[PDB]
Design a protein around this motif. Structure first.
Motif, PDB file in Angstrom:
ATOM      1  N   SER A   1       0.847  -1.212   0.000  1.00 45.30           N
ATOM      2  CA  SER A   1       0.000   0.000   0.000  1.00 45.30           C
ATOM      3  C   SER A   1       0.876   1.255   0.000  1.00 45.30           C
ATOM      4  O   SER A   1       1.415   1.652  -1.025  1.00 45.30           O
ATOM      5  N   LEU A   2       0.968   1.885   1.170  1.00 45.22           N
ATOM      6  CA  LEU A   2       1.472   3.243   1.366  1.00 45.22           C
ATOM      7  C   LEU A   2       2.766   3.129   2.147  1.00 45.22           C
ATOM      8  O   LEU A   2       3.068   2.091   2.767  1.00 45.22           O
ATOM      9  N   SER A   3       3.557   4.188   2.131  1.00 47.85           N
ATOM     10  CA  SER A   3       4.858   4.141   2.837  1.00 47.85           C
ATOM     11  C   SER A   3       4.636   4.223   4.346  1.00 47.85           C
ATOM     12  O   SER A   3       3.640   4.808   4.808  1.00 47.85           O
ATOM     13  N   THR A   4       5.554   3.648   5.101  1.00 48.59           N
ATOM     14  CA  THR A   4       5.508   3.739   6.550  1.00 48.59           C
ATOM     15  C   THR A   4       5.677   5.191   7.033  1.00 48.59           C
ATOM     16  O   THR A   4       5.001   5.618   7.998  1.00 48.59           O
ATOM     17  N   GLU A   5       6.558   5.933   6.374  1.00 46.97           N
ATOM     18  CA  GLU A   5       6.751   7.324   6.701  1.00 46.97           C
ATOM     19  C   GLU A   5       5.529   8.196   6.379  1.00 46.97           C
ATOM     20  O   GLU A   5       5.214   9.159   7.111  1.00 46.97           O
ATOM     21  N   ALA A   6       4.844   7.844   5.288  1.00 51.19           N
ATOM     22  CA  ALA A   6       3.627   8.547   4.877  1.00 51.19           C
ATOM     23  C   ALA A   6       2.483   8.294   5.862  1.00 51.19           C
ATOM     24  O   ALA A   6       1.834   9.259   6.317  1.00 51.19           O
ATOM     25  N   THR A   7       2.268   7.021   6.206  1.00 49.69           N
ATOM     26  CA  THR A   7       1.233   6.668   7.186  1.00 49.69           C
ATOM     27  C   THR A   7       1.511   7.310   8.537  1.00 49.69           C
ATOM     28  O   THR A   7       0.567   7.785   9.199  1.00 49.69           O
ATOM     29  N   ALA A   8       2.788   7.329   8.948  1.00 48.15           N
ATOM     30  CA  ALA A   8       3.144   7.959  10.203  1.00 48.15           C
ATOM     31  C   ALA A   8       2.890   9.470  10.162  1.00 48.15           C
ATOM     32  O   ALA A   8       2.502  10.068  11.188  1.00 48.15           O
ATOM     33  N   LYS A   9       3.106  10.083   8.993  1.00 47.06           N
ATOM     34  CA  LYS A   9       2.884  11.514   8.853  1.00 47.06           C
ATOM     35  C   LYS A   9       1.390  11.872   8.933  1.00 47.06           C
ATOM     36  O   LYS A   9       0.999  12.895   9.520  1.00 47.06           O
ATOM     37  N   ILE A  10       0.551  10.999   8.385  1.00 43.21           N
ATOM     38  CA  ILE A  10      -0.876  11.284   8.375  1.00 43.21           C
ATOM     39  C   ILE A  10      -1.504  11.003   9.742  1.00 43.21           C
ATOM     40  O   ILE A  10      -2.423  11.740  10.183  1.00 43.21           O
ATOM     41  N   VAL A  11      -0.991   9.991  10.423  1.00 38.34           N
ATOM     42  CA  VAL A  11      -1.423   9.730  11.789  1.00 38.34           C
ATOM     43  C   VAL A  11      -1.009  10.907  12.676  1.00 38.34           C
ATOM     44  O   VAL A  11      -1.754  11.316  13.583  1.00 38.34           O
ATOM     45  N   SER A  12       0.178  11.451  12.436  1.00 35.93           N
ATOM     46  CA  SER A  12       0.623  12.599  13.229  1.00 35.93           C
ATOM     47  C   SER A  12      -0.190  13.868  12.920  1.00 35.93           C
ATOM     48  O   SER A  12      -0.371  14.702  13.807  1.00 35.93           O
ATOM     49  N   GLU A  13      -0.667  14.023  11.689  1.00 35.95           N
ATOM     50  CA  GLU A  13      -1.444  15.224  11.354  1.00 35.95           C
ATOM     51  C   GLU A  13      -2.878  15.180  11.833  1.00 35.95           C
ATOM     52  O   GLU A  13      -3.409  16.185  12.284  1.00 35.95           O
ATOM     53  N   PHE A  14      -3.512  14.018  11.737  1.00 37.92           N
ATOM     54  CA  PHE A  14      -4.973  13.945  11.946  1.00 37.92           C
ATOM     55  C   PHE A  14      -5.386  13.383  13.292  1.00 37.92           C
ATOM     56  O   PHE A  14      -6.501  13.652  13.730  1.00 37.92           O
ATOM     57  N   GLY A  15      -4.517  12.610  13.951  1.00 34.63           N
ATOM     58  CA  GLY A  15      -4.875  12.016  15.236  1.00 34.63           C
ATOM     59  C   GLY A  15      -4.795  13.013  16.368  1.00 34.63           C
ATOM     60  O   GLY A  15      -4.276  14.120  16.202  1.00 34.63           O
ATOM     61  N   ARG A  16      -5.317  12.618  17.524  1.00 33.09           N
ATOM     62  CA  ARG A  16      -5.078  13.356  18.764  1.00 33.09           C
ATOM     63  C   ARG A  16      -3.609  13.339  19.146  1.00 33.09           C
ATOM     64  O   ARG A  16      -3.093  14.335  19.648  1.00 33.09           O
ATOM     65  N   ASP A  17      -2.952  12.214  18.900  1.00 35.75           N
ATOM     66  CA  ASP A  17      -1.495  12.103  18.984  1.00 35.75           C
ATOM     67  C   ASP A  17      -1.062  10.961  18.066  1.00 35.75           C
ATOM     68  O   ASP A  17      -1.860  10.458  17.282  1.00 35.75           O
TER      69      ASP A  17
END
Lengths: 88, 51, 271, 55, 117, 100
Positions: A1-17
């Motif tokens: 699917s998607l890059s690990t760095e990309a998924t981590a970046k989107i979790v960091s932008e949209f999540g509470r943490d």
RNA sequence: GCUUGAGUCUCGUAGAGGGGGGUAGAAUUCCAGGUGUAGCGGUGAAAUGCGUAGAGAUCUGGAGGAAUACCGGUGGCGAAGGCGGCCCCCUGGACGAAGACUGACGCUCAGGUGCGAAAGCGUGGGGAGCAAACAGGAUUAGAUACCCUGGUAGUCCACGCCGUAAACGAUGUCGACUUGGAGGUUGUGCCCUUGAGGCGUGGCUUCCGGAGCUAACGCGUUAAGUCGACCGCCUGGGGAGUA
RNA sequence: GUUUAUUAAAAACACAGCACUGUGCAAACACGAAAGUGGACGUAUACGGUGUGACGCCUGCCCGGUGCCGGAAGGUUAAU
């Protein structure tokens, strides 16, 4: 699917943490990221009817989650689809 | 495929070709492309190989 | 891109155009143009020697470089242009020393594209080089038949020639005809195939389109009187004869090559 | 098995005429029969092993 | 004549006929004999007997070369082939190699339909 | 930047141009800040089957980590170069360093 | 609100899942050449066919197209159709281990939309083999067939159409519960790993069988058993899936 | 659209389209005692000849006669 760095970046932008990786905005944004990336893939190829079935699962699943979050909190809905540039 | 032998030899005794090529492999490629009869010939060959 | 015209007004019902958005919309390069007066099919005796020719649109000749002599100097393709004298399109190219020339445009060649003539040229489509340096089994156009002369084989659009052998001082060439011909291997040739293949897909649609390419009508022989054509006469439709030219020589089969001078160079006739 | 450059190992798992031997004969659990065959084919491309014995 | 002293016996056994061609190691034929050219046309030209008399007759007609050693190369299946090489070491030849060179495709061309007999 | 295993045969008659080529190829890898892990020159080794007939050829094993673009131009370099017959570039199977 | 349903993230695993590009080796056909000589091919037997203008056999060189032996396995992957050399690029899903997160976001689905073997159709290529049509030879009472010798569309590629099959486990989807045995395949944990072991725990799958069900045949924890949700369909044969 | 200027404007001619056939360039072909010229400053997706005549569904069998194409063994066969 998607890059690990990309998924981590989107979790960091949209999540509470970070570690809040299953929230509804986060799932919607990850599905959105992959949908756009594969817009690039399926502009070419165009007869990859198997991969497209995976893509329509992503579209449908995003839709279900937007319907959930619409009928739970509409302010989160408007901020979310405002930020992701979807809905047209 | 080859055989040779030194001077103690009498008989052909080349049963290397009852091992690989002659019996099955060339008689198989004499006749039609199916996809269909082999799926059932192999189905009943593996369904016959039973105790 | 071939385009069927919508059938407003018959005459447009059956037209298929071959449009090309990459051709230059504008005037051609002037100092490579010259006057090309139309003849009418008529020799220096005034007589019609080739029939069915005459009228059509005014055309200016474009000196196309068939020789490709500027060896070793690169040239960038400036643009592509419509040439009325040919089936193919012509590319206007600009050498690095500031000389423009028109070449026949090969298939893949666009604007802003390096071509290069000469012996040490890279093998890629557009580069003219001698056929002792081209690999066997390569499509090649604009072939010379005598060294230094100019290209005469495979010039018409969508046309190539395949190099099939290099036996000695000669290369055996499968001409577009189907004919196998020996050419001297010092003869230059341009790589690739010449590039307006879809030219053959156009359909013209009406009578005046033929008229405006300069093709007068063809009266068929059986419609005439016997004084005019060998087919002639007869009280309604009446053929009864073996089909001939208007000069009595058999059409429908009869071979009309007599050279004996270039039969050395023909490995196999066409079929 | 995992590797194709070790053609001693690969040459054990091949018959005298270049053909891959079945796992019905040599044991070789199916995962390693698959890695094996795929390594034999990569080696036959490099001409480390032969495709046949009549080249 | 030309005195080659080693050759190859290419035997081409098919289902209908065996055809034995004795050549040299370069591959230039020195003389051949078919089972169908030895009398017994038809159902009898595909038998081991016909192949062995074909091989006897091909051992004759290469006497002009003084062949003593030969390899045997065998193609096709057939009622021949086995008996064929026997006839060769019944004709004084020192039979050196026996290779079977039947052409096997690596799933190439489609074979013909046939035979709803 | 992922891993690759490159092998390539070289025509035997251009064996003396082999280490030079190696250097150039390795130089191209260092053009993209990719690193090269092993490198083996296997000598003129006998071919199992003839190719243009040409028996015994010169093998070079490479095992490079690089971005895919320099690997791609390395493949086209192997296409056009008449010296090299049969290249083969493969998978990640993360960086190895050993012999065989 | 909550986590036992559903989903997200971390790390791996296996795979003929898909699309694009490249390459390799055997073989068939064709072309050119060497040797060589009277048959070859075919069949139940024959003949048509090819062959002294030199075939078939054999060796060398070349071209081209299609398919990818062995591995190969009631093996694998895919929703189904289906997918089999090797390599790269883009890409879908599944499964497993521990932990974290969302918090019922779920199930089914008329109309709708998509995908959908083969044959077929359109445009443009390609065309080695095979082969509807077709032609010849036989067989026969006849032979518009089976068999033989040729052989065109087609099969192959690109894009569009069609929209069906004994498209079949003749078994809709999702969930729960209900004795067993032998395997296969793919994970994972524990124990002297004292080896090709021992003990578990998942995913998919094959064969046999218990209760139960079934008209019987059989199905039998992958149900045709015991239940729940939603959908599709049936109502005597023909006429007719036709007008 | 064209045609019998001056009794025939038409279903006839033409036509786009189709097919067959010739033609490898000093092209075939045509005008020309020849030189030369047209074909064409074109090159087989081009050019000449012949038939049919948008488009749609199609185009069946016959190679004995006449022609054409191909073959070279034998018979016959000129000048010499």
């Amino acid at each position: 699917s998607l890059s690990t760095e990309a998924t981590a970046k989107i979790v960091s932008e949209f999540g509470r943490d970070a570690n809040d990786t299953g929230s509804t905005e986060v799932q919607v944004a990850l599905l959105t990221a992959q949908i756009n990336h594969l817009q690039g893939h399926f502009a070419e190829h165009k007869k990859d009817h198997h991969s497209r079935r995976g893509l329509l699962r992503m579209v449908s699943q995003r839709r279900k989650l937007l319907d959930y979050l619409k009928r739970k909190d509409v302010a989160r809905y408007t901020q979310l689809i405002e930020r992701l540039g979807l809905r047209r | 495929i080859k055989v040779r032998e030194n001077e103690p030899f009498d008989v052909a005794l080349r049963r290397f070709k009852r091992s690989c090529e002659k019996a099955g492999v060339l008689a198989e490629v004499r006749r039609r492309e199916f996809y269909e009869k082999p799926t059932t010939e192999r189905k009943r060959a593996k369904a016959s190989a039973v105790k | 891109a071939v385009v069927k015209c919508k059938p407003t007004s018959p005459g447009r019902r059956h037209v298929v155009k071959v449009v090309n958005p990459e051709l230059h919309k504008g005037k051609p390069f002037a100092p490579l143009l010259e006057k090309n007066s139309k003849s009418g099919g008529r020799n220096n005796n005034g007589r019609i020697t080739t029939r069915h020719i005459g009228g059509g649109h005014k055309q200016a000749y474009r000196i196309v470089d068939f020789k490709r002599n500027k060896d070793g100097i690169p040239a960038v393709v400036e643009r592509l242009e419509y040439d009325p004298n040919r089936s193919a399109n012509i590319a206007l190219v600009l050498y690095k020393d500031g000389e423009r020339r028109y070449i026949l445009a090969p298939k893949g060649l666009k604007a802003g594209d390096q071509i290069q003539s000469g012996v040490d040229a890279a093998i890629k489509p557009g580069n003219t080089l001698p056929m002792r340096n081209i690999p066997v089994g390569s499509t090649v156009h604009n072939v010379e038949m005598k060294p230094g002369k100019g290209g005469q084989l495979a010039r018409s659009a969508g046309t190539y020639v395949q190099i099939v052998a290099r036996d000695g001082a000669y290369v055996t060439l499968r001409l577009r005809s189907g004919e196998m011909r020996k050419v001297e291997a010092d003869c230059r040739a341009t790589l690739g195939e010449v590039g307006n293949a879809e030219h053959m897909l156009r359909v013209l649609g009406k009578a005046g389109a033929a008229r405006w390419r300069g093709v007068r009508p063809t009266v068929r022989g059986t419609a005439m009187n016997p004084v005019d054509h060998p087919h002639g006469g007869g009280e309604g439709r009446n053929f009864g004869k073996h089909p001939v030219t208007p000069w009595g020589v058999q059409t429908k089969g009869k071979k009309t090559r007599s050279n004996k001078r270039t039969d050395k160079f023909i490995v196999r006739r066409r079929s | 098995e995992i590797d194709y450059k070790d053609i001693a190992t690969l040459k054990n798992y091949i018959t005298e005429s270049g053909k891959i031997v079945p796992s019905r004969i040599t044991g070789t659990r199916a995962k390693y029969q698959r890695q094996l065959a795929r390594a034999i084919k990569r080696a036959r491309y490099l001409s480390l092993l032969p495709y046949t014995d009549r080249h | 004549r030309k005195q080659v002293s080693d050759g190859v016996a290419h035997i081409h056994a098919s289902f209908n006929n065996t055809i034995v061609t004795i050549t040299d190691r370069q591959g230039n034929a020195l003389g051949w004999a078919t089972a169908g050219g030895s009398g017994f046309r038809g159902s009898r030209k595909s038998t081991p007997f016909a192949a062995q008399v074909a091989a006897e007759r091909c051992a004759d007609a290469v006497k002009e070369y003084g062949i003593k050693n030969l390899e045997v190369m065998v193609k096709g299946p057939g009622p021949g082939r086995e008996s064929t090489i026997r006839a060769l070491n019944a004709a004084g030849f020192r039979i050196t190699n026996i290779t079977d060179v039947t052409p096997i495709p690596h799933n190439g061309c489609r074979p013909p339909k046939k035979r709803r007999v | 930047m992922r891993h690759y295993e490159i092998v390539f045969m070289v025509h035997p008659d251009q064996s003396e141009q082999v280490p030079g080529m190696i250097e150039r190829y390795t130089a191209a890898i260092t053009g993209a800040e990719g690193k090269i892990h092993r490198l083996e020159d296997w000598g003129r080794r006998q071919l199992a089957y003839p190719i243009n007939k040409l028996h015994k050829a010169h093998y070079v094993l490479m095992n490079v980590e690089a971005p895919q673009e320099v690997i791609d131009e390395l493949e086209t370099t192997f296409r056009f170069n008449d010296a090299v017959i049969r290249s083969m570039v493969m998978r990640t199977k993360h960086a190895v360093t050993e012999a065989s």
